[PDB]
Design a protein around this motif. Structure first.
Motif, PDB file in Angstrom:
ATOM      1  N   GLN A  93       0.825  -1.154  -0.327  1.00  0.00           N
ATOM      2  CA  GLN A  93       0.016   0.054  -0.046  1.00  0.00           C
ATOM      3  C   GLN A  93       1.033   1.366  -0.055  1.00  0.00           C
ATOM      4  N   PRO A 152       3.550   3.133  -4.616  1.00  0.00           N
ATOM      5  CA  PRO A 152       2.333   3.930  -5.273  1.00  0.00           C
ATOM      6  C   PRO A 152       2.300   3.450  -6.650  1.00  0.00           C
ATOM      7  N   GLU A 177       8.954  -8.309 -23.827  1.00  0.00           N
ATOM      8  CA  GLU A 177       9.892  -7.772 -24.799  1.00  0.00           C
ATOM      9  C   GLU A 177      11.200  -8.272 -24.840  1.00  0.00           C
ATOM     10  N   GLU A 234      10.179 -12.145 -25.702  1.00  0.00           N
ATOM     11  CA  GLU A 234      10.005 -12.271 -27.219  1.00  0.00           C
ATOM     12  C   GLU A 234      10.996 -11.928 -28.091  1.00  0.00           C
ATOM     13  N   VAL A 235      11.559 -11.098 -27.814  1.00  0.00           N
ATOM     14  CA  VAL A 235      12.693 -10.845 -28.897  1.00  0.00           C
ATOM     15  C   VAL A 235      13.661 -11.709 -29.025  1.00  0.00           C
ATOM     16  N   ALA A 278      12.596 -14.161 -31.287  1.00  0.00           N
ATOM     17  CA  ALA A 278      12.798 -13.823 -32.553  1.00  0.00           C
ATOM     18  C   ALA A 278      14.215 -13.603 -32.967  1.00  0.00           C
ATOM     19  N   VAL A 279      14.923 -13.052 -32.272  1.00  0.00           N
ATOM     20  CA  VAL A 279      16.537 -13.006 -32.405  1.00  0.00           C
ATOM     21  C   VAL A 279      17.355 -14.598 -32.607  1.00  0.00           C
ATOM     22  N   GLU A 320      15.780 -16.090 -36.107  1.00  0.00           N
ATOM     23  CA  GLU A 320      16.572 -15.399 -37.303  1.00  0.00           C
ATOM     24  C   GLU A 320      17.969 -15.590 -37.228  1.00  0.00           C
ATOM     25  N   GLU A 344      19.651 -17.412 -40.330  1.00  0.00           N
ATOM     26  CA  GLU A 344      20.809 -16.700 -40.781  1.00  0.00           C
ATOM     27  C   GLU A 344      21.862 -17.775 -40.960  1.00  0.00           C
ATOM     28  N   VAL A 371      21.251 -20.374 -44.057  1.00  0.00           N
ATOM     29  CA  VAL A 371      21.356 -20.055 -45.352  1.00  0.00           C
ATOM     30  C   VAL A 371      22.833 -20.093 -45.722  1.00  0.00           C
ATOM     31  N   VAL A 372      23.844 -19.542 -44.979  1.00  0.00           N
ATOM     32  CA  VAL A 372      25.201 -19.470 -45.257  1.00  0.00           C
ATOM     33  C   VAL A 372      25.617 -20.894 -45.272  1.00  0.00           C
TER      34      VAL A 372
END
Lengths: 49, 79, 48
Positions: C11, C14, C29, C32-33, C36-37, C40, C44, C47-48
């Motif tokens: 109490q 405040p 955040e 979640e990021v 996401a990071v 990817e 990433e 693909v290489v």
């Protein structure tokens, strides 16, 4: 309005604690409107109630 | 959102003139050019990806903000 | 009659509403990021 002295018509105000206590200023202008509301009176034009 | 501008800023080829910029409700355009030297029909040996990064204005008149500079070897694609 | 305040002091701290809204709205955040990071970057790496 004397000091330490509460009127009969006061508004209130909250503290970070959780309570409501007598402000003076805040509750000091509720009344100017009244005295004003009494010598001149208030309008309620355009209200919808 | 704001978790996207981070994964972006997470990047190494997504560099700008000023990271200070505000990247919310903004629209970006990527006019990138790629160069590549192969060593097989699929297995690359060198990859450049450059090009500007532009931003919409309230006029939508795009403008330059930052530059892409991706460098790589032995890739198998373009990220 | 009596009353027992078994509150630890919540109490005092405040404007707790968004004080709390934040404490978790940060985690999502910061969490979640990295969902996401992490993908990817893994992507990433694929693909290489």
């Amino acid at each position: 309005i004397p000091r330490e002295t509460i009127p009969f018509l006061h508004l209130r105000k909250k503290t970070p604690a959780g309570d409501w206590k007598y402000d003076r200023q805040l509750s000091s202008l509720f009344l100017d409107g009244l005295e004003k509301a009494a010598f001149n009176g208030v309008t309620f034009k355009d209200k919808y109630v | 959102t704001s978790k996207d501008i981070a994964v972006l800023r997470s990047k190494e080829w997504f560099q700008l003139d000023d990271e200070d910029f505000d990247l919310l409700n903004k629209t970006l355009t990527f006019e990138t050019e790629t160069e590549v030297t192969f060593k097989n029909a699929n297995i690359f040996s060198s990859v450049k990806c450059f090009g500007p990064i532009k931003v919409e204005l309230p006029t939508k008149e795009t403008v330059e903000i930052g530059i892409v500079d991706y460098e790589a070897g032995a890739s198998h694609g373009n990220p | 009659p009596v009353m027992a305040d078994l509150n630890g002091g919540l109490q005092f701290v405040p404007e707790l509403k968004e004080f709390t809204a934040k404490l978790r709205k940060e985690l999502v955040e910061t969490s979640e990021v990295r969902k996401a990071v992490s993908i990817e970057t893994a992507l990433e790496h694929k693909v290489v």
